[PDB]
């Protein structure tokens, strides 16, 4: 488990509230405000989930071996409804629970490059107290191609070798604005931003 | 990587045809012929997929901690069509890919006879049928129902603490459904005919 995490005392899960003025808080706030300057952050919590971390780090090591000298990991945003937050915190991102996206590049979990995309009410639905929720997520994007609405897994790199797959898909390979992942433990929810208008 | 695997010359995936009449082949043949003795076995292959095995062993250690006991694993059967065999060998079982009466997961049978039905182990253009022997993390289980995307909670007072799998019948189970990647490791592939 990462050495800067708070001691959990044999606990496998906890949320840690970050302090404004710490570099850890301030970098997430800057990443968010770059495209969401009109919203205000209530708090940022570090997600310490031992089991999700273990499974994710195993998948990362495998993709680092398979792809050899690629930047396989991106830090991306995911807006969700309050009713989903307890499940994501404990179990991560389940494609079986994902909605149809307004522009579908496949049936998977969607992650945004820009916080502004995730900040739409359609993804970060305001709760009964006007709080919006967005995860900051380590995503194994690996080698990616433009997706298509029919995909249930990423497409093959070569049609004559149907099982050798891209790691993820995007809307545009030249200027990616979203990524779609189709497998469990390909994304680690690292921070939860609670924010308001 | 388990003792009974044979050397892979620094590769991460291999299918190894078992030798008839040796202990390993005999163990797997007997599990199948318990209910499928009228079939003809052409071959049994051991699936050596390092990455699937790693991801499965991690989930096993996690389930052994969560459940506070070490009896979470069952050996079950899965019939599939010939065109799905390369995908399962390389990537394992994928719920996103027949009836799903007990939930939208991957189905495993207690009896080879159930998986030997032509609707599951679809005969290819040469009459050959395919069935996996699968290590499955069934863990603590409950009765499934149509439309589940995950197992139910163990107590709806804590809705995120889930059963590990569902079944048709808790007292005398004949099939199990799992809803997560890397809860099932395909260990052997049986090629057989009617
Ligand atoms: O071996 C199988 N391979 N693929 C399946 O979809 C499958 C499904 C299965 O029960 C599905 C429903 C009938 C009552 C529940 C049993 C076995 C298999």
XYZ file of C-alpha atoms and ligand atoms in Angstrom:
409
model
C 0.000 0.000 0.000
C 1.386 3.515 -0.755
C 3.523 4.816 2.191
C 1.847 8.319 2.307
C -1.619 6.719 2.946
C -2.993 7.131 6.514
C -2.584 4.047 8.769
C -5.941 2.176 8.506
C -5.355 -0.159 11.546
C -6.040 -3.508 9.721
C -9.056 -1.736 8.010
C -9.208 -2.345 4.201
C -11.022 0.947 3.357
C -11.203 4.602 4.397
C -11.792 8.100 2.974
C -9.226 10.798 4.006
C -10.234 14.495 3.885
C -7.414 16.620 2.312
C -6.300 20.047 3.653
C -6.279 23.085 1.297
C -2.686 24.431 1.050
C -1.236 20.866 0.854
C 0.264 20.146 -2.641
C -1.995 17.012 -2.847
C -5.231 19.120 -2.440
C -3.946 22.050 -4.544
C -2.969 19.959 -7.674
C -6.451 18.293 -7.793
C -8.127 21.720 -7.292
C -5.988 23.198 -10.173
C -6.726 20.179 -12.470
C -10.478 20.698 -11.746
C -10.607 24.562 -11.917
C -8.710 24.620 -15.305
C -12.168 23.857 -16.940
C -14.639 24.273 -13.934
C -13.717 27.800 -12.582
C -17.499 28.574 -12.165
C -18.001 25.722 -9.556
C -16.660 25.699 -5.926
C -15.108 22.641 -4.184
C -16.625 21.688 -0.781
C -13.981 19.002 -0.058
C -11.569 16.490 -1.656
C -11.234 12.990 -0.099
C -8.374 10.547 -0.852
C -9.855 7.045 -1.435
C -7.778 4.315 0.320
C -9.263 0.991 -0.875
C -6.660 -1.769 -0.300
C -8.384 -4.455 -2.500
C -9.185 -2.133 -5.458
C -5.586 -0.802 -5.297
C -4.097 -4.349 -5.327
C -6.201 -5.511 -8.343
C -5.521 -2.227 -10.251
C -1.712 -2.364 -9.582
C -1.668 -6.016 -10.868
C -3.463 -4.926 -14.111
C -1.013 -1.945 -14.441
C 2.076 -4.200 -14.112
C 0.565 -6.567 -16.777
C -0.123 -3.677 -19.244
C 3.407 -2.221 -18.553
C 4.877 -5.716 -19.464
C 2.558 -6.221 -22.520
C 2.991 -2.705 -24.071
C 6.727 -2.156 -23.069
C 7.655 1.615 -22.632
C 4.143 3.146 -23.054
C 2.624 5.729 -20.655
C -0.340 3.353 -19.929
C -1.973 5.438 -17.130
C -3.891 8.751 -17.401
C -5.557 10.755 -14.620
C -9.164 11.352 -15.724
C -12.543 12.501 -14.301
C -15.802 10.605 -13.740
C -18.978 12.418 -12.628
C -21.630 10.258 -10.907
C -24.852 10.467 -8.817
C -24.736 10.381 -4.958
C -26.515 6.951 -4.961
C -23.466 5.440 -6.885
C -20.716 6.914 -4.585
C -20.827 4.200 -1.834
C -20.603 1.392 -4.510
C -17.751 3.095 -6.461
C -15.790 3.805 -3.188
C -15.958 0.066 -2.164
C -16.091 -1.773 -5.572
C -14.872 0.685 -8.264
C -16.335 1.146 -11.789
C -18.769 -1.553 -13.042
C -19.534 -1.432 -16.832
C -22.766 -3.429 -16.079
C -24.100 -0.246 -14.265
C -22.940 2.289 -16.978
C -25.519 4.461 -18.839
C -25.697 4.901 -22.642
C -23.483 7.989 -23.370
C -24.997 10.813 -25.542
C -22.159 9.993 -28.037
C -21.489 6.226 -27.572
C -18.024 4.843 -28.477
C -18.856 1.497 -26.810
C -20.644 -0.120 -23.834
C -18.159 0.585 -21.013
C -17.256 3.061 -18.261
C -16.573 6.623 -19.586
C -13.807 8.947 -18.245
C -13.283 12.601 -19.279
C -9.982 14.453 -19.939
C -11.699 17.765 -18.849
C -13.523 18.179 -15.482
C -16.070 20.430 -17.360
C -17.419 17.297 -19.216
C -17.854 15.314 -15.943
C -19.376 18.478 -14.271
C -22.517 18.270 -16.530
C -25.691 17.553 -14.440
C -26.254 14.466 -16.703
C -23.128 12.793 -15.046
C -22.500 14.623 -11.702
C -26.254 14.778 -10.854
C -26.803 17.301 -7.995
C -28.069 15.558 -4.784
C -31.042 16.862 -2.662
C -28.553 19.368 -1.000
C -27.122 20.636 -4.351
C -23.833 18.666 -3.975
C -22.194 17.280 -7.160
C -19.647 14.356 -7.008
C -16.706 13.747 -9.404
C -13.950 11.097 -9.052
C -10.334 11.707 -10.066
C -9.339 8.314 -11.479
C -6.118 6.506 -12.451
C -7.171 4.869 -15.785
C -5.171 2.265 -17.760
C -5.836 3.758 -21.259
C -2.808 1.859 -22.693
C -2.894 1.664 -26.537
C -6.239 3.079 -27.766
C -8.182 3.642 -31.028
C -11.411 5.471 -31.987
C -14.340 3.494 -30.506
C -17.764 2.598 -31.973
C -21.254 2.249 -30.416
C -21.449 -1.597 -30.817
C -18.298 -2.469 -28.739
C -18.677 -4.760 -25.679
C -14.790 -4.988 -25.429
C -12.070 -2.879 -27.120
C -11.621 -3.849 -30.798
C -8.801 -6.088 -32.078
C -5.607 -4.314 -33.285
C -5.677 -6.744 -36.281
C -8.912 -8.304 -37.678
C -7.040 -11.604 -38.466
C -6.078 -11.874 -34.711
C -9.414 -11.189 -32.950
C -8.119 -11.742 -29.323
C -5.162 -9.221 -29.397
C -7.055 -6.081 -28.208
C -6.546 -2.334 -27.822
C -6.584 -1.451 -24.048
C -9.278 1.301 -24.401
C -11.140 3.426 -26.978
C -11.524 7.203 -27.374
C -13.702 9.685 -29.354
C -10.660 11.037 -31.312
C -7.026 9.645 -31.311
C -5.554 13.081 -32.354
C -7.448 15.046 -29.586
C -8.831 12.565 -27.006
C -11.601 14.032 -24.779
C -12.974 10.726 -23.393
C -11.821 7.135 -22.831
C -13.942 3.982 -22.447
C -12.690 0.929 -20.490
C -14.410 -2.473 -20.719
C -12.777 -4.470 -17.834
C -12.897 -4.533 -13.999
C -9.846 -3.119 -12.126
C -8.704 -1.018 -15.182
C -9.528 2.209 -13.244
C -8.746 3.166 -9.580
C -10.958 5.878 -7.983
C -8.225 7.936 -6.226
C -10.065 11.161 -5.128
C -13.729 12.184 -4.673
C -14.416 15.904 -5.277
C -17.650 17.186 -3.640
C -18.592 20.536 -5.267
C -21.484 23.037 -5.695
C -22.527 25.963 -7.955
C 2.939 -19.947 -11.036
C 1.653 -23.381 -9.902
C 3.951 -26.475 -9.543
C 1.996 -28.722 -12.044
C 2.435 -26.144 -14.893
C 5.225 -27.069 -17.353
C 7.964 -24.572 -18.432
C 6.777 -21.819 -20.848
C 10.217 -20.634 -22.153
C 9.561 -17.100 -20.709
C 6.103 -16.898 -22.487
C 2.994 -15.801 -20.445
C 0.375 -17.985 -22.285
C 0.440 -21.678 -23.418
C -2.185 -24.464 -23.979
C -0.548 -27.810 -22.972
C -2.132 -31.049 -24.260
C -2.262 -33.550 -21.331
C -0.797 -37.101 -21.714
C -3.569 -39.769 -21.496
C -3.181 -42.240 -18.570
C -1.190 -39.797 -16.366
C -2.529 -38.697 -12.929
C -3.566 -35.145 -14.043
C -5.386 -36.293 -17.246
C -7.089 -39.111 -15.196
C -8.291 -36.670 -12.451
C -9.888 -34.312 -15.039
C -11.301 -37.201 -17.231
C -12.992 -38.745 -14.103
C -14.690 -35.393 -13.129
C -16.169 -35.251 -16.698
C -17.117 -38.999 -17.065
C -18.969 -38.907 -13.654
C -21.919 -37.525 -15.765
C -20.584 -37.628 -19.425
C -19.351 -41.273 -19.866
C -21.365 -41.664 -23.174
C -19.179 -38.901 -24.822
C -15.780 -39.392 -26.580
C -12.807 -37.271 -25.295
C -10.487 -36.222 -28.183
C -8.118 -34.242 -25.879
C -7.683 -32.321 -22.593
C -5.454 -29.178 -22.579
C -4.114 -27.362 -19.473
C -4.595 -23.554 -19.773
C -1.399 -21.757 -18.608
C -2.360 -18.025 -18.673
C 0.041 -16.210 -16.266
C -1.902 -12.863 -16.214
C -5.369 -14.480 -15.649
C -3.834 -16.707 -12.927
C -2.206 -13.644 -11.174
C -5.513 -11.659 -11.240
C -7.506 -14.700 -9.997
C -4.982 -15.510 -7.151
C -5.253 -11.856 -5.940
C -9.092 -12.087 -5.814
C -8.740 -15.476 -4.007
C -6.428 -13.995 -1.269
C -8.896 -11.044 -0.917
C -11.961 -13.356 -0.623
C -10.074 -15.589 1.933
C -9.471 -12.377 4.077
C -13.052 -10.947 3.597
C -14.727 -14.308 4.489
C -12.217 -15.226 7.318
C -11.949 -18.865 6.012
C -10.164 -20.592 3.057
C -13.015 -22.647 1.410
C -14.182 -20.107 -1.274
C -13.207 -22.128 -4.442
C -15.170 -24.823 -6.442
C -14.234 -26.741 -9.627
C -17.104 -26.225 -12.142
C -17.836 -26.700 -15.900
C -18.553 -24.200 -18.691
C -19.599 -25.273 -22.226
C -18.957 -22.749 -25.011
C -18.972 -22.482 -28.847
C -15.683 -23.042 -30.769
C -15.510 -19.321 -31.819
C -15.382 -18.241 -28.069
C -12.490 -20.660 -27.175
C -9.587 -18.326 -28.223
C -11.110 -15.380 -26.243
C -11.668 -17.474 -23.044
C -8.129 -18.993 -23.265
C -6.554 -15.475 -23.462
C -9.046 -13.237 -21.535
C -11.191 -15.629 -19.408
C -14.967 -15.206 -18.863
C -16.741 -11.915 -19.698
C -20.336 -11.287 -18.520
C -20.686 -8.683 -21.363
C -20.527 -11.463 -24.070
C -28.663 -18.223 -23.784
C -30.980 -17.722 -20.721
C -29.673 -15.507 -17.812
C -32.511 -16.496 -15.383
C -30.285 -16.107 -12.223
C -28.521 -12.846 -13.264
C -26.346 -11.140 -15.933
C -23.112 -12.989 -14.974
C -21.074 -15.965 -16.253
C -22.711 -19.384 -15.606
C -20.856 -22.508 -14.334
C -22.400 -26.001 -13.859
C -21.727 -28.524 -11.022
C -22.277 -31.402 -13.590
C -20.472 -31.752 -16.969
C -23.793 -33.230 -18.323
C -25.446 -29.752 -17.952
C -22.589 -27.951 -19.835
C -22.570 -30.793 -22.501
C -25.996 -29.579 -23.868
C -25.648 -28.430 -27.536
C -27.078 -24.958 -26.552
C -23.852 -24.388 -24.399
C -21.100 -26.637 -25.911
C -22.317 -25.973 -29.513
C -20.969 -28.672 -31.907
C -18.636 -27.032 -34.544
C -18.690 -27.888 -38.325
C -16.723 -31.150 -37.481
C -19.027 -32.277 -34.540
C -16.427 -31.252 -31.866
C -17.801 -29.824 -28.545
C -15.757 -27.680 -26.045
C -16.073 -27.481 -22.236
C -13.793 -25.768 -19.660
C -13.027 -27.068 -16.178
C -12.984 -23.820 -14.152
C -11.693 -22.750 -10.713
C -14.538 -20.485 -9.463
C -14.545 -18.217 -6.375
C -18.168 -19.072 -5.346
C -17.453 -17.875 -1.730
C -20.654 -17.186 0.308
C -23.656 -17.558 -2.054
C -27.448 -16.998 -2.168
C -30.342 -17.697 -4.586
C -30.121 -15.577 -7.764
C -32.970 -14.012 -9.782
C -33.450 -12.514 -13.288
C -31.873 -9.070 -13.891
C -29.122 -9.079 -11.136
C -25.993 -7.142 -12.341
C -24.119 -8.015 -9.052
C -24.862 -10.489 -6.218
C -27.359 -9.175 -3.600
C -26.135 -7.621 -0.311
C -25.755 -10.019 2.718
C -27.825 -7.447 4.723
C -29.694 -4.517 3.044
C -28.648 -2.445 6.175
C -25.143 -2.471 4.495
C -25.921 -2.576 0.743
C -22.199 -2.682 -0.428
C -21.226 -5.907 1.509
C -22.135 -8.481 -1.213
C -22.568 -12.267 -1.529
C -19.662 -13.629 -3.696
C -21.974 -15.490 -6.161
C -25.562 -16.649 -6.746
C -27.016 -20.133 -7.376
C -30.292 -21.796 -8.544
C -30.684 -23.546 -5.113
C -28.653 -22.828 -1.898
C -29.358 -26.287 -0.289
C -28.337 -28.360 -3.391
C -26.685 -26.064 -5.981
C -26.357 -27.202 -9.648
C -25.133 -23.878 -11.125
C -23.301 -20.719 -9.985
C -23.204 -17.203 -11.497
C -20.277 -14.766 -10.856
C -20.466 -11.080 -11.846
C -16.804 -9.905 -11.769
C -13.738 -10.402 -13.998
C -11.067 -12.705 -12.480
C -13.513 -14.625 -10.161
C -13.072 -17.655 -12.525
C -9.866 -19.233 -13.935
C -10.273 -21.596 -16.933
C -7.868 -24.434 -15.913
C -8.641 -27.190 -18.534
C -10.303 -27.343 -21.994
C -11.992 -30.699 -22.906
C -12.544 -31.333 -26.668
C -15.171 -34.121 -27.083
C -17.945 -35.491 -29.400
C -21.419 -37.066 -28.969
O -21.983 -24.486 -19.328
C -22.592 -23.427 -19.560
N -22.085 -22.588 -20.492
N -22.730 -21.377 -20.816
C -23.874 -20.992 -20.198
O -24.391 -19.930 -20.535
C -24.444 -21.868 -19.236
C -25.646 -21.531 -18.576
C -26.176 -22.362 -17.622
O -27.352 -22.070 -16.976
C -28.167 -21.057 -17.599
C -29.609 -21.062 -17.167
C -30.415 -22.356 -17.369
C -30.893 -22.273 -15.926
C -29.970 -21.079 -15.683
C -25.513 -23.562 -17.301
C -24.346 -23.888 -17.924
C -23.800 -23.058 -18.903
